[PDB]
Design a protein around this ligand. Structure first.
Ligand SMILES: [Zn+2]
Ligand SMILES: [Zn+2]
Lengths: 16, 84
């Protein structure tokens, strides 16, 4: 209930 | 709004790996992003997602609403989300 917050991040690592 | 039908999720502990079967692109999400993704998989609407995040993290609601808004938009830009 008291975790340290950081903004959610989407990271693209590659492709087929 | 929902997760695209063409996406498959790989759960590795705290984090989530996403693959889009149509675009052939793959992604990783951090702790908070993955928490949000799990809630999306459960079909939770953004308001419910915001409630969940605020209950688990030390953060003001406006920050969460703003960040979530950016995050969902980022997902949609990669076609990971649809109907957003
Ligand atoms: Zn679809
Ligand atoms: Zn899942």
């Amino acid at each position: 209930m008291t975790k340290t917050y950081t903004a959610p991040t989407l990271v693209e690592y590659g492709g087929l | 709004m929902k997760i695209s039908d063409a996406v498959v999720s790989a759960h590795i502990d705290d984090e989530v790996v996403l693959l889009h079967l149509q675009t052939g692109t793959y992604f990783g999400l951090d702790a908070v992003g993955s928490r949000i993704w799990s809630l999306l998989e459960e079909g939770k609407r953004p308001e419910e997602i915001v409630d969940a995040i605020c209950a688990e993290y030390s953060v003001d609601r406006p920050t969460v609403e703003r960040d979530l808004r950016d995050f969902l938009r980022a997902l949609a830009n990669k076609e990971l989300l649809e109907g957003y």
